[PDB]
Amino acid sequence: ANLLTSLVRAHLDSGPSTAKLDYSKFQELVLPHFGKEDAGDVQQFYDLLSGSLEVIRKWAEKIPGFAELSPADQDLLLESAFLELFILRLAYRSKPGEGKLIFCSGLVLHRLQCARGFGDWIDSILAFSRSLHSLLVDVPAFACLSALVLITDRHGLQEPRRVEELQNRIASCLKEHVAAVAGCLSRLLGKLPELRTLCTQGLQRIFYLKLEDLVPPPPIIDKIFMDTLPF
Amino acid sequence: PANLLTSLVRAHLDSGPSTAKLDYSKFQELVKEDAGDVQQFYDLLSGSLEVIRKWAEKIPGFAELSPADQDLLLESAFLELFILRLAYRSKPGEGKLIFCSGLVLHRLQCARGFGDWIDSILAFSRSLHSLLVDVPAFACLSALVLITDRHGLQEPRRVEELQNRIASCLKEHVAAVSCLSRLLGKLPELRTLCTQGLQRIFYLKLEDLVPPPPIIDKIFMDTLPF
Ligand SMILES: CCCCCCCCN(C)C(=O)c1cc(O)c(O)c(O)c1
């Protein structure tokens, strides 16, 4: 289909091919002091977050109908879904059988290289990679599901009906694609609790790093952090 | 001063339960969080609020500080005062937590409310116990946690003068009986444990099964350096 083709184009252009996988910082072993971190670790944590948000903004821009939402509805959807999309995309593209995290830049980093910046959270994101990989979700389904994570009801949308209409079109597009392959949706929804838990772990880690204030969080991440806290 | 050590010991012993008023009625020797675990966590924290205030006012010098500095020192030090008094009063050997009301509980009857933090608190307690810290040494230690430099003090010189009097009183007692610096060594380990408390309240405010009571919330909000 034309919506599916567009969703798949956007997904594939928002990450790296096997070709431009960047091993310039990958180390199979490092010997970290666990349960602590330095300014360098925290800056990279924040840079990987910033890089993913930049890339998720350009992917959302290429979903048909999204660019025509009000600027504020675009922002609200992007902030509300950022953390959930960062985890879901990082989980889908990573190699947990080799302890490999693959960020959207093409940067590859060992579990142990992420431990200082991310803490426990990255162990859990790798656990979810295995969980996700076991469901054998093809690229076109994932391309739809990531968009359904973004284009969803949120408190404070100016045009909630336009967002629901676009939700309808994308849900319909996915149904068509699982019909075309049939000639797993109950099971996928089974994972939504681990994923909500991983979003909470993310907020826990930003809170901790803000408490420690080795380096301040980037303005745009700090706003997502603050705007997400129901209090 | 002299009579200062004695004043500090009297404050400490009057702030805690007489070995008589110890209450085992709710103690279970064999046993995520729901609302009752969160309510209990907030109740256990809240029970120390008035007791730590009454203790502070009985520290010679403390009522001589500006009212704003008093409130600031109390608020800044609450979590650490809670952890250290609990650590000292509790029997980690047996996983027995003893609250300043006399309530006695096993770690597994609080673990769901406190999370991981209770194991850290109990780890700290075993370590505190190892030093065999005598009541007078502890009477000054706890005061040193309260009477310490904080951001936003009106009279930081005066707060620092009071601290030095209390450290002098401690050093003298500890000499009159590397030990000193292993007592003082517990103050910064207490700050690291403070942080886990803030992490736990942050998490509970996110989950929001029950809201923190306003005085805890205020202490939470006022102790975030951002
Ligand atoms: C691996 C499982 C993820 C697949 C996406 C399924 C939910 C998408 N839909 C339809 C939503 O309305 C939605 C629901 C949410 O709980 C949510 O946080 C959100 O951002 C959007």
Coordinates of C-alpha atoms and ligand atoms in Angstrom, one line a residue:
Chain A
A1 CA 0.0 0.0 0.0
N2 CA 1.0 3.7 -0.3
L3 CA 0.6 4.6 3.4
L4 CA 2.6 1.3 4.3
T5 CA 5.3 2.1 1.7
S6 CA 5.6 5.7 3.2
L7 CA 5.7 4.4 6.8
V8 CA 8.4 1.8 5.8
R9 CA 10.4 4.5 3.8
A10 CA 10.4 6.7 7.0
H11 CA 11.3 3.9 9.4
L12 CA 14.3 2.6 7.2
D13 CA 15.6 6.2 6.7
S14 CA 15.5 6.9 10.5
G15 CA 18.2 4.3 11.3
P16 CA 21.5 2.8 9.9
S17 CA 22.0 0.0 7.2
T18 CA 24.5 -2.8 8.0
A19 CA 27.0 -0.8 5.8
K20 CA 27.3 2.4 8.0
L21 CA 27.4 0.6 11.4
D22 CA 30.1 2.6 13.3
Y23 CA 32.5 0.4 15.4
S24 CA 34.9 3.4 16.0
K25 CA 34.0 3.4 19.8
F26 CA 32.9 -0.3 20.3
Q27 CA 35.0 -2.2 22.9
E28 CA 34.0 -5.9 23.6
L29 CA 35.5 -5.5 27.2
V30 CA 35.8 -2.5 29.4
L31 CA 36.3 -2.6 33.2
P32 CA 33.9 0.0 34.7
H33 CA 33.3 1.0 38.4
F34 CA 29.6 -0.1 38.5
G35 CA 27.1 2.2 40.5
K36 CA 28.9 5.4 39.6
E37 CA 29.6 7.6 36.5
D38 CA 31.8 10.6 35.4
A39 CA 30.8 13.8 33.4
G40 CA 31.9 11.9 30.1
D41 CA 29.4 9.0 30.7
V42 CA 26.5 11.4 31.6
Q43 CA 27.2 13.7 28.6
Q44 CA 27.1 10.7 26.2
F45 CA 23.9 9.4 27.8
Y46 CA 22.3 12.9 27.2
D47 CA 23.8 13.0 23.6
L48 CA 22.3 9.6 22.7
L49 CA 18.9 10.9 23.9
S50 CA 19.3 14.2 22.0
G51 CA 20.5 12.3 18.8
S52 CA 17.4 9.9 19.0
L53 CA 14.9 12.9 19.5
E54 CA 16.5 14.8 16.5
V55 CA 16.1 11.5 14.4
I56 CA 12.5 10.7 15.7
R57 CA 11.5 14.4 14.9
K58 CA 12.6 13.8 11.2
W59 CA 10.9 10.4 11.1
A60 CA 7.5 11.8 12.4
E61 CA 7.8 14.6 9.8
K62 CA 7.8 11.9 7.1
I63 CA 4.6 10.2 8.4
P64 CA 1.7 11.4 6.0
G65 CA -0.6 13.7 7.9
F66 CA 1.8 14.4 10.8
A67 CA 3.4 17.6 9.3
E68 CA -0.2 19.0 8.8
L69 CA -1.0 18.8 12.6
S70 CA -0.8 22.0 14.6
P71 CA 2.9 22.8 15.6
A72 CA 1.8 22.3 19.3
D73 CA 0.1 18.9 18.6
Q74 CA 3.3 17.8 16.8
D75 CA 5.4 18.8 19.9
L76 CA 2.9 17.2 22.4
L77 CA 2.9 13.9 20.5
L78 CA 6.8 13.9 20.1
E79 CA 7.4 14.6 23.8
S80 CA 4.7 12.2 25.1
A81 CA 6.1 9.3 23.0
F82 CA 9.9 10.1 22.8
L83 CA 11.1 7.8 25.7
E84 CA 8.8 4.9 24.6
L85 CA 10.0 5.3 20.9
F86 CA 13.7 5.5 22.0
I87 CA 13.4 2.3 24.0
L88 CA 11.3 0.4 21.3
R89 CA 13.6 1.4 18.4
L90 CA 16.8 0.7 20.5
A91 CA 15.3 -2.7 21.5
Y92 CA 14.3 -3.5 17.8
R93 CA 17.7 -2.6 16.2
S94 CA 20.1 -4.0 19.0
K95 CA 21.9 -7.4 19.1
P96 CA 21.3 -8.7 22.6
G97 CA 22.9 -12.1 21.8
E98 CA 26.2 -10.1 21.5
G99 CA 25.5 -7.5 24.3
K100 CA 25.4 -4.9 21.5
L101 CA 23.3 -1.7 21.7
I102 CA 22.9 0.0 18.3
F103 CA 21.9 3.7 18.5
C104 CA 20.2 5.5 15.6
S105 CA 23.5 7.3 14.6
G106 CA 24.9 3.8 13.7
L107 CA 27.1 3.9 16.9
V108 CA 27.6 0.4 18.4
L109 CA 28.4 0.2 22.2
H110 CA 28.8 -2.8 24.5
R111 CA 26.3 -3.3 27.5
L112 CA 29.4 -2.6 29.8
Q113 CA 30.2 0.7 27.9
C114 CA 26.5 1.8 28.6
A115 CA 26.5 0.7 32.3
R116 CA 28.1 3.9 33.6
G117 CA 25.7 6.4 31.8
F118 CA 22.5 4.4 31.7
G119 CA 22.8 2.2 34.9
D120 CA 20.6 -1.0 35.2
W121 CA 18.2 0.5 32.6
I122 CA 20.3 -0.7 29.6
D123 CA 20.4 -4.3 31.0
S124 CA 16.5 -4.1 31.0
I125 CA 16.3 -2.6 27.5
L126 CA 18.5 -5.6 26.3
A127 CA 16.1 -8.0 28.1
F128 CA 13.2 -6.3 26.1
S129 CA 15.3 -6.6 22.8
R130 CA 15.2 -10.5 23.4
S131 CA 11.4 -10.3 24.3
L132 CA 10.7 -8.2 21.1
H133 CA 13.0 -10.3 18.7
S134 CA 11.2 -13.5 19.9
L135 CA 7.8 -12.1 18.5
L136 CA 9.3 -11.9 14.9
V137 CA 7.7 -8.5 14.1
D138 CA 8.5 -7.8 10.4
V139 CA 9.7 -4.2 9.4
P140 CA 6.3 -3.1 7.9
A141 CA 4.4 -4.1 11.1
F142 CA 7.0 -2.3 13.3
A143 CA 6.9 0.7 10.9
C144 CA 3.1 0.9 11.7
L145 CA 3.3 0.1 15.4
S146 CA 6.0 2.8 16.1
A147 CA 3.7 5.3 14.3
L148 CA 0.7 4.1 16.5
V149 CA 3.0 4.8 19.6
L150 CA 3.3 8.4 18.3
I151 CA -0.2 9.2 16.8
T152 CA -2.4 8.5 19.8
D153 CA -4.7 10.4 22.1
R154 CA -2.9 12.7 24.6
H155 CA -4.3 15.1 27.2
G156 CA -4.0 18.7 25.7
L157 CA -4.2 17.9 22.0
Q158 CA -5.8 20.9 20.1
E159 CA -7.2 18.6 17.3
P160 CA -7.8 15.1 18.9
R161 CA -10.2 14.1 16.1
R162 CA -7.5 14.6 13.4
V163 CA -5.1 12.5 15.5
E164 CA -7.8 9.7 15.9
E165 CA -8.5 9.8 12.1
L166 CA -4.7 9.3 11.4
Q167 CA -4.7 6.6 14.1
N168 CA -7.6 4.9 12.2
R169 CA -5.7 5.1 8.8
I170 CA -2.6 3.6 10.4
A171 CA -4.4 0.8 12.4
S172 CA -6.2 0.0 9.1
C173 CA -2.9 0.0 7.1
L174 CA -1.4 -2.5 9.7
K175 CA -4.6 -4.8 9.5
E176 CA -4.2 -5.0 5.7
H177 CA -0.5 -5.9 6.0
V178 CA -1.1 -8.8 8.6
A179 CA -3.9 -10.0 6.2
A180 CA -1.4 -9.9 3.2
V181 CA 1.2 -12.0 5.2
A182 CA -1.3 -14.4 6.8
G183 CA -2.4 -15.2 3.2
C184 CA 0.7 -12.4 17.5
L185 CA -1.2 -9.1 18.3
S186 CA -2.5 -10.4 21.7
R187 CA 1.2 -11.4 22.3
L188 CA 2.7 -8.0 21.2
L189 CA 0.2 -6.2 23.7
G190 CA 1.5 -8.7 26.4
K191 CA 4.8 -6.7 26.3
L192 CA 3.3 -3.2 26.8
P193 CA 3.8 -3.5 30.6
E194 CA 7.6 -4.2 30.3
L195 CA 7.8 -1.2 28.0
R196 CA 5.8 1.1 30.4
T197 CA 8.2 -0.1 33.1
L198 CA 11.2 0.7 30.9
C199 CA 9.8 4.3 30.3
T200 CA 9.6 4.7 34.2
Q201 CA 13.2 3.3 34.6
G202 CA 14.3 6.0 32.0
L203 CA 12.6 8.8 34.0
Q204 CA 14.2 7.3 37.2
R205 CA 17.7 7.5 35.6
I206 CA 17.2 11.2 34.4
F207 CA 16.0 12.1 37.9
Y208 CA 19.0 10.5 39.5
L209 CA 21.4 12.2 37.0
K210 CA 19.7 15.6 37.6
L211 CA 20.1 15.0 41.4
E212 CA 23.9 14.2 40.8
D213 CA 24.1 17.2 38.3
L214 CA 27.7 16.1 37.1
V215 CA 26.5 18.0 33.9
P216 CA 23.1 19.5 33.3
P217 CA 20.6 17.8 31.0
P218 CA 20.0 19.4 27.6
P219 CA 17.1 21.9 27.6
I220 CA 14.9 19.9 25.3
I221 CA 15.3 16.6 27.3
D222 CA 14.7 18.4 30.6
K223 CA 11.4 19.8 29.2
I224 CA 10.3 16.3 28.1
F225 CA 11.3 15.1 31.6
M226 CA 9.4 17.9 33.4
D227 CA 6.3 17.9 31.0
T228 CA 6.0 14.0 31.5
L229 CA 5.9 14.1 35.3
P230 CA 2.2 14.0 36.4
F231 CA 2.8 16.5 39.3
Chain B
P1 CA 30.4 21.5 77.8
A2 CA 30.8 19.0 79.7
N3 CA 27.1 19.8 80.4
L4 CA 26.8 20.0 76.5
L5 CA 27.6 16.2 76.0
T6 CA 25.1 15.5 78.9
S7 CA 22.5 17.8 77.2
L8 CA 23.0 15.9 73.9
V9 CA 22.7 12.4 75.6
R10 CA 19.5 13.5 77.4
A11 CA 18.0 14.8 74.1
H12 CA 18.8 11.5 72.3
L13 CA 17.5 9.2 75.0
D14 CA 14.2 11.3 75.4
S15 CA 13.6 11.1 71.6
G16 CA 13.3 7.3 71.4
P17 CA 11.3 4.4 73.0
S18 CA 12.1 3.1 76.5
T19 CA 12.9 -0.7 76.2
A20 CA 9.4 -1.0 77.9
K21 CA 7.4 0.9 75.2
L22 CA 8.8 -1.5 72.4
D23 CA 5.7 -3.0 70.6
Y24 CA 5.9 -6.5 69.0
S25 CA 2.1 -6.9 68.5
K26 CA 2.5 -6.4 64.6
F27 CA 6.0 -8.2 64.4
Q28 CA 5.8 -11.3 62.0
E29 CA 9.0 -13.4 62.1
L30 CA 7.9 -15.3 58.8
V31 CA 5.7 -13.6 56.1
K32 CA 4.7 -5.0 43.5
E33 CA 3.8 -2.7 46.4
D34 CA 0.0 -1.9 46.8
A35 CA -1.5 1.2 48.4
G36 CA -1.1 -0.1 52.0
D37 CA 2.7 -0.6 51.5
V38 CA 3.0 3.0 50.2
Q39 CA 0.7 4.4 53.0
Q40 CA 2.8 2.5 55.6
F41 CA 6.1 3.9 54.1
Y42 CA 4.7 7.5 54.3
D43 CA 3.4 6.7 57.9
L44 CA 6.8 5.4 59.1
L45 CA 8.6 8.5 57.7
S46 CA 5.9 10.9 59.2
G47 CA 6.1 9.3 62.7
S48 CA 9.7 10.8 63.1
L49 CA 8.7 14.4 62.0
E50 CA 7.6 15.7 65.5
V51 CA 10.2 13.5 67.4
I52 CA 13.2 14.9 65.4
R53 CA 11.8 18.5 65.8
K54 CA 11.5 18.0 69.7
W55 CA 15.0 16.4 69.7
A56 CA 16.5 19.3 67.7
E57 CA 15.0 22.0 70.0
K58 CA 16.7 20.3 73.1
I59 CA 20.2 20.7 71.4
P60 CA 21.9 23.6 73.3
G61 CA 22.4 26.4 70.7
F62 CA 19.9 25.1 68.2
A63 CA 17.0 27.4 69.3
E64 CA 19.5 30.3 69.3
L65 CA 19.7 30.0 65.5
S66 CA 17.3 32.0 63.3
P67 CA 13.9 30.3 62.8
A68 CA 14.5 30.1 59.0
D69 CA 17.9 28.4 59.5
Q70 CA 16.2 25.9 62.0
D71 CA 13.4 25.0 59.5
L72 CA 16.1 24.7 56.7
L73 CA 18.5 22.5 58.8
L74 CA 15.5 20.3 59.9
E75 CA 14.2 19.8 56.4
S76 CA 17.7 19.3 54.8
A77 CA 18.6 16.7 57.5
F78 CA 15.3 14.8 58.0
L79 CA 16.0 11.8 55.7
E80 CA 19.5 11.4 57.0
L81 CA 18.3 11.7 60.7
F82 CA 15.6 9.1 59.9
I83 CA 18.2 6.6 58.3
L84 CA 20.9 7.0 61.1
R85 CA 18.5 6.8 64.1
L86 CA 16.8 3.8 62.5
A87 CA 20.2 2.2 61.7
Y88 CA 21.4 2.7 65.3
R89 CA 18.1 1.6 66.9
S90 CA 17.6 -1.5 64.7
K91 CA 19.0 -5.1 65.0
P92 CA 20.3 -5.9 61.4
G93 CA 21.5 -9.3 62.7
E94 CA 17.8 -10.3 62.8
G95 CA 16.4 -7.9 60.0
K96 CA 14.4 -6.2 62.9
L97 CA 13.5 -2.5 62.1
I98 CA 12.6 -0.5 65.3
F99 CA 10.8 2.8 64.7
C100 CA 11.0 5.7 67.2
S101 CA 7.4 5.0 68.2
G102 CA 8.6 1.5 69.5
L103 CA 6.9 -0.3 66.5
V104 CA 9.1 -3.4 65.6
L105 CA 8.9 -4.9 62.1
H106 CA 10.8 -7.5 60.0
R107 CA 12.5 -6.1 56.7
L108 CA 10.0 -8.1 54.6
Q109 CA 7.0 -6.3 56.3
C110 CA 8.4 -2.9 55.0
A111 CA 10.4 -4.0 51.8
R112 CA 7.4 -3.4 49.4
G113 CA 7.0 0.2 50.8
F114 CA 10.7 1.1 51.0
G115 CA 12.0 -1.0 48.0
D116 CA 15.8 -1.8 47.7
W117 CA 16.5 1.2 50.0
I118 CA 15.7 -1.0 53.2
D119 CA 18.6 -3.5 52.3
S120 CA 21.0 -0.5 51.9
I121 CA 19.7 1.0 55.3
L122 CA 20.2 -2.5 56.9
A123 CA 23.7 -2.8 55.3
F124 CA 24.5 0.6 56.8
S125 CA 23.1 -0.6 60.2
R126 CA 25.4 -3.7 60.3
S127 CA 28.3 -1.3 59.5
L128 CA 27.2 1.3 62.2
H129 CA 26.9 -1.6 64.8
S130 CA 30.5 -2.8 63.9
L131 CA 31.9 0.5 65.2
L132 CA 30.3 -0.2 68.6
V133 CA 29.4 3.6 68.8
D134 CA 28.5 4.6 72.4
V135 CA 25.4 6.7 73.1
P136 CA 27.3 9.9 73.8
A137 CA 29.4 9.6 70.5
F138 CA 26.1 8.9 68.6
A139 CA 24.3 11.8 70.5
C140 CA 27.0 14.2 68.9
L141 CA 27.1 12.3 65.5
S142 CA 23.3 12.8 65.1
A143 CA 23.6 16.6 66.1
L144 CA 26.5 17.0 63.5
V145 CA 24.1 15.7 60.8
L146 CA 21.6 18.4 61.8
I147 CA 24.1 21.3 62.5
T148 CA 26.0 21.4 59.1
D149 CA 26.5 23.9 56.2
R150 CA 23.4 23.9 53.8
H151 CA 22.5 26.1 50.8
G152 CA 20.4 29.2 51.9
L153 CA 21.6 29.6 55.5
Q154 CA 21.1 33.2 56.9
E155 CA 23.9 32.8 59.6
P156 CA 26.3 30.1 58.2
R157 CA 29.1 31.3 60.6
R158 CA 26.8 30.7 63.6
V159 CA 25.7 27.2 62.4
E160 CA 29.4 26.4 61.8
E161 CA 30.3 27.7 65.3
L162 CA 27.6 25.4 66.9
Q163 CA 28.9 22.4 64.7
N164 CA 32.5 23.1 66.0
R165 CA 31.4 23.2 69.6
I166 CA 29.7 19.8 69.0
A167 CA 32.7 18.3 67.2
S168 CA 35.0 19.5 70.0
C169 CA 32.6 17.9 72.5
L170 CA 32.8 14.6 70.4
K171 CA 36.6 14.6 69.9
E172 CA 37.1 15.1 73.7
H173 CA 34.7 12.3 74.6
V174 CA 36.3 9.9 72.0
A175 CA 39.8 10.8 73.4
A176 CA 38.6 10.6 77.1
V177 CA 37.8 6.9 76.5
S178 CA 41.3 7.0 63.3
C179 CA 38.3 6.0 65.5
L180 CA 37.1 9.7 65.3
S181 CA 37.5 9.7 61.5
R182 CA 35.6 6.3 61.2
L183 CA 32.7 7.9 63.1
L184 CA 32.9 11.0 60.9
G185 CA 33.3 8.6 57.9
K186 CA 29.6 7.5 58.4
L187 CA 28.3 11.1 57.7
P188 CA 29.0 11.0 53.9
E189 CA 27.9 7.3 53.5
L190 CA 24.6 8.6 55.1
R191 CA 24.4 11.3 52.3
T192 CA 24.6 8.6 49.6
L193 CA 21.7 6.7 51.5
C194 CA 19.8 10.1 51.6
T195 CA 19.8 10.1 47.7
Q196 CA 18.2 6.5 47.6
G197 CA 15.3 8.0 49.8
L198 CA 14.8 10.8 47.2
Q199 CA 14.9 8.2 44.4
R200 CA 12.3 6.1 46.3
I201 CA 9.9 9.0 46.9
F202 CA 10.3 10.2 43.2
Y203 CA 9.3 6.7 42.1
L204 CA 6.3 6.6 44.5
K205 CA 5.1 10.1 43.3
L206 CA 5.3 8.7 39.7
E207 CA 3.4 5.4 40.5
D208 CA 1.0 7.6 42.6
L209 CA -0.9 4.8 44.4
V210 CA -1.1 7.2 47.4
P211 CA 0.2 10.7 47.4
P212 CA 3.0 11.8 49.8
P213 CA 1.6 13.7 52.8
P214 CA 2.3 17.4 52.4
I215 CA 5.3 17.8 54.9
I216 CA 7.2 14.9 53.2
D217 CA 6.4 16.3 49.7
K218 CA 7.6 19.8 50.9
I219 CA 10.8 18.2 52.2
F220 CA 11.1 16.2 48.9
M221 CA 10.5 19.4 46.8
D222 CA 12.8 21.7 48.9
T223 CA 15.8 19.2 48.9
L224 CA 16.1 18.9 45.0
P225 CA 18.9 21.3 44.0
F226 CA 17.0 22.2 40.7
Ligands
LIG1 C1 5.4 -3.5 21.7 C2 4.1 -2.8 21.9 C3 3.9 -1.5 21.2 C4 3.0 -1.5 20.1 C5 2.0 -0.3 20.0 C6 0.7 -0.6 20.6 C7 0.0 0.6 21.2 C8 -0.3 1.7 20.3 N1 -1.6 2.4 20.4 C9 -2.6 2.0 19.5 C10 -1.8 3.3 21.4 O1 -2.9 3.9 21.4 C11 -0.8 3.6 22.4 C12 -0.9 2.9 23.7 C13 0.0 3.2 24.7 O2 -0.1 2.6 25.9 C14 1.0 4.2 24.5 O3 1.9 4.5 25.4 C15 1.1 4.8 23.2 O4 2.0 5.8 23.0 C16 0.2 4.5 22.2

